[PDB]
Amino acid sequence: NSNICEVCNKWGRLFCCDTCPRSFHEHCHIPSVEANKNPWSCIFCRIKTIQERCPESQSGHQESEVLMRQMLPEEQLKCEFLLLKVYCDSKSCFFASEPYYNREGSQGPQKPMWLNKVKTSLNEQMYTRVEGFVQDMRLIFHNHKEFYREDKFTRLGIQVQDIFEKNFRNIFAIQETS
């Protein structure tokens, strides 16, 4: 196994996947690494199994159909994995914890949102459709862009949204378009 967390790239108290060489901090993996379970397989491996069991699941889909899916166990896992992919980028730090807003010439968003809040919401099974999770994720970056206006810091929201969107299209097998 790797000797650094797959998500944050640091060493520490690491749990190793039995079916692949990746390793994780307890609360870096999503869901948090399970108490017992020998052997244990990471989210990466669980996602690869879904694909392998239903090869046609990789055929293109329309975003509108994906959003309307109910959050059955496979969709729950796909959203957990998508969230984890965002935490894998170091720029996610800006979006992880609860924000506050006090900048001359700007007003804070009406509905603040952050990654740890989406993570708690997934853990608590608060989303009934994929659309609820995707809407909160896109709201994180939209709030950032509107608040930071012409400050160059706005770019961090564009960057981390691009990671989210590329991974959304991959994980949910969105039909490729020009």
* Terminal C-alpha separation, the chain: 39
Tokens of 44: 């990466």
Three-state secondary-structure class, residue 151: coil
Closest by Cα among 143, 27, 42, 35 to 87: 27
- The answer to whether 43 contacts Zn ion (rule: CB under 5 A) is no
Nearest to Zn ion of 28, 84 (CB atom): 28
Nearest to Zn ion of 12, 68 (CB atom): 12
Residue from the set 14, 23, 25, 79 that interacts with Zn ion by CB under 5 A: 25
Please report how close the Cβ of residue 50 comes to Zn ion at its closest, in angstroms: 10
Nearest to Zn ion of 7, 71 (CB atom): 7
d(CA 87, CA 96): 8
The one-letter amino acid code at 84 reads L
Classify residue 33 by its DSSP letter. Answer: P
Please report how close the Cβ of residue 39 comes to Zn ion at its closest, in angstroms: 10
Nearest to Zn ion of 15, 44 (CB atom): 44
All residues at 6 or more sequence positions from 44 whose CB lies less than 8 Å from its CB, including other chains? 6, 17, 20, 22, 81
Residue from the set 33, 42, 47, 122 that interacts with Zn ion by CB under 5 A: 42
Q: Which stretch binds Zn ion (CB under 5 A): 45-53, 118-126, 139-147, 153-161?
A: 45-53
- The answer to whether 93 contacts Zn ion (rule: CB under 5 A) is no
Binding residues for Zn ion, per CB under 5 A? 5, 7-8, 17, 20, 25, 28, 42, 44-45, 54
